[PDB]
Amino acid sequence: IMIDAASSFVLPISITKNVDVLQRTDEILWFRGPSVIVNERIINSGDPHLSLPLNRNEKESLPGPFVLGLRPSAKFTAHRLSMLR
Amino acid sequence: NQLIPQAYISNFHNRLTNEDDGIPIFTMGNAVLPDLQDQHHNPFNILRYPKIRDTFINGKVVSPYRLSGEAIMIPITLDIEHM
């Protein structure tokens, strides 16, 4: 199992006309596999949607993925911006 | 490392034959020397002065030469043509 493969490639034709949105070298970088989209980085480790307790067929349409991601409440953020100045 | 040795430059004869310095021994900011101006502890800054890269470029390496009740003073003149 090797480590030092290249795994990125560049085509010789300068097509740099409509490409300011992609990832440029500074040309266009062309990798050997796709990307990986990760929804939320921090798992919410309790929350019986995920913990599955052993007590007591049901569906639930939760709002967004933001339930599973430890977001702070806004009153603390306003308190901290008041503590800013 | 990065330290200048303490000796081994004797650029004196080229200033004797510089023809800008008014030395009568031979015939054939806005300051000039940084003896009042700091250089913020880089020696490379002293290479901006035009009489000092003269003594690093045109210098050489020298080897050191090694060695009554009333004084009577006598003046001695010296006048020799040579080449």
Partner: peptide
């Protein structure tokens, strides 16, 4: 376009780790 072999970018591991960024240490004329 299907005959357009691409150029590998090699990383050369010792370049990736610790490369810094000689006359500017004044001891060598």
């Amino acid at each position: 376009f299907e005959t357009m072999v691409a150029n590998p970018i090699k990383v050369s591991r010792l370049q990736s780790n610790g490369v810094l960024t000689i006359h500017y240490s004044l001891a060598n004329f």
